[PDB]
């Protein structure tokens, strides 16, 4: 398959992903094309956040879908 990743209010990248991949794999590819460490990433697919343990199929991500990448740089 092939999905898109829109980062904040800026660029958009493409990723060749399989439905069985986990979200950690997607964030790893985002690291391979962007350099952002996965632990500083969070992915949003229309409202809901994407857990690292789940897969793309669990969220029913069709081909050419646009995930929204947000930086996780703040906590308690």
């Amino acid at each position: 398959m092939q999905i898109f990743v829109k980062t904040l209010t800026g660029k958009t990248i493409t990723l060749e992903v399989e439905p069985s991949d986990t979200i950690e794999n997607v964030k790893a590819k985002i690291q391979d094309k962007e350099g952002i460490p996965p632990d500083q990433q969070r992915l949003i697919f229309a409202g809901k956040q994407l857990e690292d343990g789940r897969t793309l199929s669990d969220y029913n991500i069709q081909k050419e879908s646009t995930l929204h990448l947000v930086l996780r740089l703040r906590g308690c």
Partner: protein
Amino acid sequence: PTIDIDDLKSNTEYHKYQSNSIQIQWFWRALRSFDQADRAKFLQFVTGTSKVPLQGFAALEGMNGIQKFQIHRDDRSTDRLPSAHTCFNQLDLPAYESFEKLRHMLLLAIQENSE
């Protein structure tokens, strides 16, 4: 809009950086060059709010009391973005290789908003 950066620098704790560490000098040099809006964005990034205490940054808080601003050395990767812990007014700063990289990553960190 009122940030005596010398007052914040005189009330900043370090670990494992030193006050004369090169990344600390680059940090204060970069924070000096920011607009008042960008300094407020940094204050919100590190402490969750842009308000300044009436007694200066010596009375900075803080979850259970006064907690001074503190910069910590992120010994994980020079290619990772800065991070903050808010609850403790602490900024995680990696040992960046250049002043330009530190200022660029700092601006990129503080200018991500709406979340």
